[PDB]
Curated annotation (Swiss-Prot):
Oligomeric form and interacting partners: Component of some HBO1 complex composed of KAT7/HBO1, MEAF6, ING4 and BRD1/BRPF2. Component of the MOZ/MORF complex composed at least of ING5, KAT6A, KAT6B, MEAF6 and one of BRPF1, BRD1/BRPF2 and BRPF3. Interacts (via PHD-type zinc finger domain) with unmodified histone H3. Interacts (via PWWP domain) with dimethylated and trimethylated 'Lys-79' on histone H3.
Record-listed cross-link Glycyl lysine isopeptide (Lys-Gly) (interchain with G-Cter in SUMO2), residues: K41
Top-rank taxon, per record: Eukaryota
Signal peptide extent: none
Domain Bromo: 9-113
Locations listed in the record: Nucleus; Chromosome
Protein's name according to its UniProt entry: Bromodomain-containing protein 1
Residues of the full protein shown: 555 to 674 of 1058
Gene: BRD1
Tissue: Highly expressed in testis.
Function: Scaffold subunit of various histone acetyltransferase (HAT) complexes, such as the MOZ/MORF and HBO1 complexes, that acts as a regulator of hematopoiesis. Plays a key role in HBO1 complex by directing KAT7/HBO1 specificity towards histone H3 'Lys-14' acetylation (H3K14ac), thereby promoting erythroid differentiation.
Length: 121
């Protein structure tokens, strides 16, 4: 149906926008601390601590299969990256401090992306 196609064009356009958002968010992590999943070879107990791991590569795979239906879904995943890190790592670590910075710098990007999604529909 033509209705089905039009929904698919909206999903595709959301996907393009989210990809630009994702790149911008990832530029706020020049150390690439959040680029890849936490290794279970190098932190074998990780899953006793964190129930829903997330990282930029896993968000990117989900994005390219058009797996984000709206911005809320994307934001939940971004917030997981941050919130996982601030629980697992202590306050005085390079990791925790990098989360705080990504959160603060990412909030500006997400502020305007929410206007762009509402605005463009």
């Amino acid at each position: 149906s033509m209705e089905q196609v039009a929904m698919e064009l909206r999903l595709t356009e959301l996907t393009r926008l989210l990809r630009s958002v994702l790149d911008q968010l990832q530029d706020k992590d020049p150390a690439r601390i959040f680029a890849q999943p936490v290794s279970l070879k190098e932190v074998p107990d990780y899953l006793d601590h964190i129930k829903h791991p997330m990282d930029f590569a896993t968000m990117r795979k989900r994005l390219e299969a058009q797996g984000y239906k709206n911005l809320h879904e994307f934001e939940e995943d971004f917030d997981l990256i941050i919130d996982n890190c601030m629980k697992y790592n202590a306050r005085d670590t390079v990791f925790y401090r990098a989360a705080v910075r990504l959160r603060d710098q990412g909030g500006v990007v997400l502020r305007q992306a929410r206007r762009e999604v509402d605005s463009i529909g």
